Design a protein around this motif. Structure first.
Motif, PDB file in Angstrom:
ATOM      1  N   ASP A   5       1.339  -1.343  -0.247  1.00  0.00           N
ATOM      2  CA  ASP A   5       0.080  -0.117  -0.183  1.00  0.00           C
ATOM      3  C   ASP A   5       0.903   1.392   0.018  1.00  0.00           C
ATOM      4  O   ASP A   5       1.275   1.481   0.906  1.00  0.00           O
ATOM      5  CB  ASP A   5      -0.792   0.020   1.357  1.00  0.00           C
ATOM      6  N   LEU A   8      -0.255   4.103   2.881  1.00  0.00           N
ATOM      7  CA  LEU A   8       0.733   4.192   4.177  1.00  0.00           C
ATOM      8  C   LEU A   8       1.768   4.313   4.496  1.00  0.00           C
ATOM      9  O   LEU A   8       2.534   4.730   4.779  1.00  0.00           O
ATOM     10  CB  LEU A   8       0.919   2.172   3.928  1.00  0.00           C
ATOM     11  N   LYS A  25      -3.761   3.783   8.581  1.00  0.00           N
ATOM     12  CA  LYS A  25      -4.454   3.015   8.258  1.00  0.00           C
ATOM     13  C   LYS A  25      -4.331   2.676   6.790  1.00  0.00           C
ATOM     14  O   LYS A  25      -3.831   3.452   6.108  1.00  0.00           O
ATOM     15  CB  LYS A  25      -6.066   3.429   8.802  1.00  0.00           C
ATOM     16  N   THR A  26      -4.907   1.655   6.257  1.00  0.00           N
ATOM     17  CA  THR A  26      -4.402   0.736   4.302  1.00  0.00           C
ATOM     18  C   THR A  26      -6.188   0.614   3.877  1.00  0.00           C
ATOM     19  O   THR A  26      -7.098   0.133   4.470  1.00  0.00           O
ATOM     20  CB  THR A  26      -3.580   0.387   3.887  1.00  0.00           C
ATOM     21  N   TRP A  27      -6.570   0.852   2.451  1.00  0.00           N
ATOM     22  CA  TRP A  27      -7.911   0.146   1.887  1.00  0.00           C
ATOM     23  C   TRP A  27      -7.726   0.175   0.880  1.00  0.00           C
ATOM     24  O   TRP A  27      -8.473   0.418  -0.051  1.00  0.00           O
ATOM     25  CB  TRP A  27      -8.800   2.395   2.038  1.00  0.00           C
ATOM     26  N   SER A  31      -2.369  -5.011   0.228  1.00  0.00           N
ATOM     27  CA  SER A  31      -1.530  -4.541   0.988  1.00  0.00           C
ATOM     28  C   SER A  31      -0.575  -4.811   2.119  1.00  0.00           C
ATOM     29  O   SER A  31      -1.060  -6.232   2.842  1.00  0.00           O
ATOM     30  CB  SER A  31      -2.622  -3.302   2.276  1.00  0.00           C
ATOM     31  N   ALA A  43      -2.126  -0.660   9.617  1.00  0.00           N
ATOM     32  CA  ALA A  43      -3.200  -0.873   9.543  1.00  0.00           C
ATOM     33  C   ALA A  43      -3.711  -1.793   8.261  1.00  0.00           C
ATOM     34  O   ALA A  43      -4.284  -1.194   7.544  1.00  0.00           O
ATOM     35  CB  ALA A  43      -4.890  -1.079  10.099  1.00  0.00           C
ATOM     36  N   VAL A  44      -2.998  -2.487   7.305  1.00  0.00           N
ATOM     37  CA  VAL A  44      -3.118  -3.422   6.118  1.00  0.00           C
ATOM     38  C   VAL A  44      -4.479  -3.535   5.930  1.00  0.00           C
ATOM     39  O   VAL A  44      -5.105  -4.376   5.933  1.00  0.00           O
ATOM     40  CB  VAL A  44      -2.340  -3.929   6.362  1.00  0.00           C
ATOM     41  N   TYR A  45      -5.095  -3.260   4.941  1.00  0.00           N
ATOM     42  CA  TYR A  45      -6.406  -3.655   4.190  1.00  0.00           C
ATOM     43  C   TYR A  45      -5.987  -5.052   3.835  1.00  0.00           C
ATOM     44  O   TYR A  45      -5.077  -5.174   2.564  1.00  0.00           O
ATOM     45  CB  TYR A  45      -7.042  -2.522   3.421  1.00  0.00           C
ATOM     46  N   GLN A  49     -10.724  -6.263   5.621  1.00  0.00           N
ATOM     47  CA  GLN A  49     -10.298  -4.972   6.538  1.00  0.00           C
ATOM     48  C   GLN A  49      -8.538  -4.934   7.111  1.00  0.00           C
ATOM     49  O   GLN A  49      -7.787  -5.009   6.072  1.00  0.00           O
ATOM     50  CB  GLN A  49     -10.160  -6.399   8.364  1.00  0.00           C
ATOM     51  N   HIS A  50      -8.290  -3.881   7.998  1.00  0.00           N
ATOM     52  CA  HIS A  50      -7.463  -3.565   8.294  1.00  0.00           C
ATOM     53  C   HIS A  50      -6.991  -3.609   9.602  1.00  0.00           C
ATOM     54  O   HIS A  50      -7.182  -3.153  10.354  1.00  0.00           O
ATOM     55  CB  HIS A  50      -7.620  -1.794   8.513  1.00  0.00           C
TER      56      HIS A  50
END
Length: 73
Positions: A5, A8, A25-27, A31, A43-45, A49-50
């Protein structure tokens, strides 16, 4: 192969400049962690979920299974 990501990094490289030990956080979807995450809980998506994985200098290389290799039990 896997993608890290970039969203990030835009926040983690900023934490590596002053020394902030917060979470990024990531989306995206696939990731993955990087060397710049050795002191951040990103919080890797994973696709839905992250997962805020605090990566150290030996946990990066996958995406979140190296920081959360545990089942429900």
């Amino acid at each position: 192969g896997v993608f890290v990501d970039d969203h990030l990094l835009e926040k983690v490289l900023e934490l590596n400049a002053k020394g902030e030990k917060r979470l990024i956080k990531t989306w995206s979807r696939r990731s993955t962690i990087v060397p710049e995450m050795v002191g951040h809980t990103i919080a890797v998506y994973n696709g839905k979920q992250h997962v805020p994985v605090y990566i150290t200098e030996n946990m990066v290389g996958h995406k979140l299974g190296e920081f959360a290799p545990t089942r429900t039990y």
